[PDB]
UniProtKB/Swiss-Prot annotation:
This is Heat shock protein 104. Residues 1-145 form the Clp R domain. It comes from the Eukaryota. Homohexamer, forming a ring with a central pore. The hexamer is stabilized by high protein concentrations and by ADP or ATP. Oligomerization influences ATP hydrolysis activity at NBD2. Interacts with YDJ1. Interacts (via C-terminal DDLD tetrapeptide) with CNS1, CPR7 and STI1 (via TPR repeats); under respiratory growth conditions. It comes from Saccharomyces cerevisiae (strain ATCC 204508 / S288c) (Baker's yeast). Induction: By heat stress dependent on the heat shock transcription factor HSF1 and the general stress transcription factors MSN2 and MSN4. Expressed at a higher level in respiring cells than in fermenting cells. Expressed in stationary phase cells and spores (at protein level). Required, in concert with Hsp40 (YDJ1) and Hsp70 (SSA1) and small Hsps (HSP26), for the dissociation, resolubilization and refolding of aggregates of damaged proteins after heat or other environmental stresses. Extracts proteins from aggregates by unfolding and threading them in an ATP-dependent process through the axial channel of the protein hexamer, after which they can be refolded by components of the Hsp70/Hsp40 chaperone system. Substrate binding is ATP-dependent, and release of bound polypeptide is triggered by ATP hydrolysis. Residues 2-71 are annotated as: Repeat 1.
């Protein structure tokens, strides 16, 4: 039910939590995964949105990364990294947004749209001086009338 790229982001999100000894997986981890460099050698999806929206991407990354690495480490590192409640709702929202867009798979677009409904994410965008509604408009423009009907459909470009 997830696209390849959506899946990459969720996996990347898990690695990020792990690499920093964070106890729970949270929305910030997904946001933080959006700004990793793709192995793709390509421009990240969210970077395109931010720059076409004409915000400062460098300042944006600093703000996001600073919110990630200031999450306090837990040792005893739990056997698992639990998805928190906020993240559960975010994923649950992404599937609803997928259906409203009449798409067949949950894409990185849907996850990004779902992240916007979460309060911590909103607080982060406000710290980075980025208007969420503007990014939402860029996201629609990015996608045009493209149907997300394959797991490869949600291109970064």
């Amino acid at each position: 039910q997830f696209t390849e790229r959506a899946l990459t982001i969720l996996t990347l999100a898990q690695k990020l939590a792990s690499d920093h000894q964070h106890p729970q997986l949270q929305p910030i981890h997904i946001l933080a995964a959006f700004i990793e460099t793709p192995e793709d050698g390509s421009v990240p999806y969210l970077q395109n949105l931010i720059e076409k929206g004409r915000y400062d991407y460098d300042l944006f990354k600093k703000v996001v990364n600073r919110n990630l690495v200031r999450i306090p480490q837990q040792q005893p590192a739990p056997a698992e990294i639990t998805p928190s409640y906020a993240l559960g709702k975010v994923l649950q929202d992404a599937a609803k947004i997928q259906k409203q867009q009449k798409d067949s798979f949950i894409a990185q677009d849907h996850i990004l749209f779902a992240l916007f409904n979460d309060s911590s994410i909103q607080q982060i965008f406000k710290e980075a001086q980025v208007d969420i509604e503007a990014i939402k408009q860029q996201a629609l423009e990015l996608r045009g009338n493209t149907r997300i009907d394959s797991r490869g459909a949600d291109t970064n470009t």
